[PDB]
């Protein structure tokens, strides 16, 4: 009882520290809601080192924990589950080199605290298998195509046709993630999001699913879903070009070029924070360069 | 030995070289 209270206090303190670090990253100053949500998700993934975990590690781990043949809406009880995280931890350690290794408790305890924040706001301690499974399928690293194929596999029937109820529950579970990073008003669940994304009459295949979710532009309720992945890809790209607002000699990340003005280029920080100057106006269109 | 076989080969090379010199 006393040790349980101490562990609960430690987990709450770790969650508070993670949220304080997220707020100290000045990502809330970003005016664009989509890019702010993508940056918050990227920071959470990097702090929890979940960018190093692909969908296949999660699949093998849930197969080990007998989660593959279980009902998606099965509430998970409160337990230590030390071997559950040990499976992923040792799977990574056997593949990663000694020097390229991470912490033992901070790596997963913060993830558990964030999962509790995203899916258990009332502190019930019971989370359905579907919610955690979708969170692990989405927030894991690797290729978005494989995770999306897995999601479409689990939201469809044996005939490969997506179920509207399963897709609706999937949208419900994944739109709680912006609420975890304080983006509820920005990206919250609405009764017309599923209707906007897909029609109730036209049958959607796997090819149609991939074309619709990776359409240009993506749907509003999931537009941050691929962009975060892109934010993972462009996070270490070097550009030897000068800027126009901060006058940075070298800029790392997304590139934005104005097609109206002459010799005016801006970094990702200047573009996301609403920084502008000169005869240029904020309503001018920007073309995004990832390289 | 490989070294000794090489040395006898060098002796062969040297004798061929001097034979060619006296031919010239």
């Amino acid at each position: 009882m006393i040790e349980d209270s101490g562990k609960r206090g430690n987990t709450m303190a770790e969650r508070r520290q993670l949220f304080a670090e997220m707020r100290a990253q000045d990502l809330d100053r970003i005016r664009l809601s989509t890019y702010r949500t993508a940056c918050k998700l990227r920071f959470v993934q990097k702090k929890c080192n979940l960018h190093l975990v692909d969908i296949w590690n999660v699949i093998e781990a849930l197969r080990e924990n007998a989660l593959n043949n279980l009902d998606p809406n099965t509430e998970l009880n409160v337990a230590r589950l030390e071997a559950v995280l040990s499976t992923i931890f040792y799977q990574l350690n056997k593949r990663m080199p000694t020097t390229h290794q991470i912490h033992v408790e901070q790596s997963i305890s913060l993830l558990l605290n964030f999962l509790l924040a995203a899916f258990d706001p009332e502190g019930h301690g019971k989370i359905s298998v579907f919610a955690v499974k979708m969170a692990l399928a989405t927030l894991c690293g690797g290729k978005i195509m494989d995770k999306l194929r897995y999601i479409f596999s689990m939201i469809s029937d044996s005939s490969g046709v997506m179920v509207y109820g399963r897709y609706d529950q999937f949208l419900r579970e994944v739109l709680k993630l912006p609420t975890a990073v304080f983006e509820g008003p920005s990206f919250g669940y609405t009764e017309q999001s599923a209707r906007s994304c897909f029609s109730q009459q036209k049958k959607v295949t796997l090819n149609g699913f991939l074309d619709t979710l990776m359409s240009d532009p993506p749907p509003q309720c999931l537009v941050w879903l691929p962009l975060l992945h892109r934010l993972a890809n462009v996070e270490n790209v070097f550009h030897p070009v000068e800027c126009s607002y901060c006058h940075s000699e070298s800029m790392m990340g997304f590139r934005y070029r104005c097609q109206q003005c002459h010799n005016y280029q801006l970094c990702q920080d200047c573009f996301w924070r609403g920084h502008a100057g000169g005869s240029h106006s904020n309503q001018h269109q920007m073309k995004e360069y990832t390289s | 030995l490989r070294g000794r076989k090489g040395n006898l080969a060098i002796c062969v090379i040297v004798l061929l070289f001097l034979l060619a010199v006296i031919n010239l």
Binding site: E64, A83, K94 | -
Partner: protein, 335 residues
Amino acid sequence: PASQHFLSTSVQGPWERAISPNKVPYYINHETQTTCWDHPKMTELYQSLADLNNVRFSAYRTAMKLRRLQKALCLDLLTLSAACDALDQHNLKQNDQPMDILQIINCLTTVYDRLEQEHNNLVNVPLCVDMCLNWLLNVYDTGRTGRIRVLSFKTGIISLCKAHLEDKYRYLFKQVASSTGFCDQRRLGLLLHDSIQIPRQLGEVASFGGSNIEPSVRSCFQFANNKPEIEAALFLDWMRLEPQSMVWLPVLHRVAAAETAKHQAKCNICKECPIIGFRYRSLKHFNYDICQSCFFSGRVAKGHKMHYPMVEYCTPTTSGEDVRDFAKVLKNKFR
């Protein structure tokens, strides 16, 4: 024991070291219901292994680690004939027969007495018996019940002994097949399950399709033209097809063979001549030969290509064959 508090801090977290009635320590992975042992000699062996996480690929890692174990366990000195005589001497012929600690101890003593008589200066019977019991109960005693199956022990010893690869394949097939020589889905699944209990002990089970034996059985019976039962010849052919979950044993045999290989060639990165061990020759460029010392680190000379084909010599080359493949690579680069 007094060493419990001393060596319980060698591992941390969910791992929980516990002692056994046979006074052999073992770790505990409690929520997985799986348990593994760690003797101090095997503890220093695993500590030496932990610094060898530099292998880039999967099958190479498993083969090299298993070769290091087999040479360290001195079980490479054991032949197929001696192990077969020892197992037939104890009447351990029924694959489903429960096995207590005493029967395994007796069979291990039977093997290691002959091994010491052949290797007096290389085999110590009690230490080797303890080490091999440690490894076998690591692989096939995750429940700490003291009972194992004869088939799993047979598979482990035959895989870890010194014999021809096809001889081990044939003996294991005879072990799993019926008196008529036919093997259905269930016996193949049991054998594949016993095989997959090995990589999970070290931590490289997911790289070969995980612990799900169903795709392996499906592939084997699809190669069998959907036959209800498979034969020894078809089993050998499907094994030579190099499945995902069994390639590790031929890779082990190859690395054991190439451990004494000496190639008259120069490494095209670290300039090591002659090549000793594994020689790798590119099938696109010319005069590019790399030693496994730089190959395992992932460092590449002149960069990789759109396709960068490679052949892996494990034996000293024949001049006719390498002139033929050089003619082939000139033909490839001509186009």
